[PDB]
Design a binder for these strands. Structure first.
Length: 188
RNA sequence: AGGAUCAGGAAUCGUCACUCUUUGACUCUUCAAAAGAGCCACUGAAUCCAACUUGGUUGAUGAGUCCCAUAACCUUUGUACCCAGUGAGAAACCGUAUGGCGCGAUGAUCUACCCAUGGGUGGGUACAAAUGGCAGUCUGACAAGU
């Protein structure tokens, strides 16, 4: 967590798991290794420090861990794909209540940042998802996939609104919340 | 002339310890919670299960010996008492001119009921005694160290 203000407030984040809220013990080597290297990042500071607000898509893991930005430490919930694919892109809700997780098999899970519970598991893509977003009002959510599809869904509602077919498969998705556009890189 | 405000009456010490009491601080701590200058990291310690080790039913641990089972409190059977004390009252002559145990204070005299001063029953008080009551002969599987 580098600080562009002051070079000494730059601090390395913790990787120390919270003691698991279930009680049955967690899965990992006792030689505790670091988390595998990350391919995607996601953070909204709307409700910071009341729960987790950093989602990181680690290398070749079926889930993606959550972190408190304020506590400089990986938080309590890990967020799965639930279709046995890799997490290949993540983004979070601007209300700080949802993290969106896009599989390599196309399933987009909407986990909650409250209890680590899932909300909905969308299935539109049969290729990999490669970039997700939500609009700034948390009304209409987009996703770009490795199928060449950009899917328009509502978030309050549950209907697939639109389905734009682009030419090459779509590698990434950047959204502008203030102006409701969204950009994408493709293989073209 | 008697009393109370601002000569009829002991109190001039360069301290050493000791003890006691007193209150205050204090690490804490119950009433009883509640609030937490918050997060990381490093490093230390401690505890608890798993683990392993050593010892252990040839007995690990747990344990009110002494407050006396060596008893207390009774209960029944053999004795000592008293409603030790009482204290002046108990029985009628004399070996060979003469001599005495012939009582007794220095002790004579006795040891709530019925029966003509013969015997005992009843209660308190004490002890000896119980193979009598009250009053029915321990646990047994982990422990301990990292």
């Amino acid at each position: 967590s580098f600080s562009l203000r002051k070079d000494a407030q730059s601090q390395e984040m913790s990787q120390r798991l919270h003691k698991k809220q279930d009680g049955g013990r967690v899965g990992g080597s006792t030689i505790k290794s670091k988390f595998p290297e990350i391919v995607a990042l996601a953070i909204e500071n709307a409700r910071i420090g009341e729960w987790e607000n950093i989602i990181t898509a680690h290398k070749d893991e079926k889930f993606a861990r959550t972190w408190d930005m304020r506590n400089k430490r990986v938080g309590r919930w890990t967020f799965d794909t639930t279709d046995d694919g890799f997490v290949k892109s993540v983004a979070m809700s601007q209300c700080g209540n949802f993290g969106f997780i896009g599989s390599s098999n196309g399933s987009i899970t909407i986990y909650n940042m409250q209890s680590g519970i899932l909300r909905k598991k969308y299935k539109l893509h049969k290729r990999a998802v490669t970039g997700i977003s939500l609009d700034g009002m948390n009304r209409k959510m987009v996703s770009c996939g490795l199928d060449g599809i950009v899917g328009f869904y509502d978030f309050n509602k549950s209907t697939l609104l639109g389905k734009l077919k682009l030419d090459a498969p779509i590698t990434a998705m950047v959204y502008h919340r203030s102006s409701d556009l969204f950009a994408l890189a493709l293989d073209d």
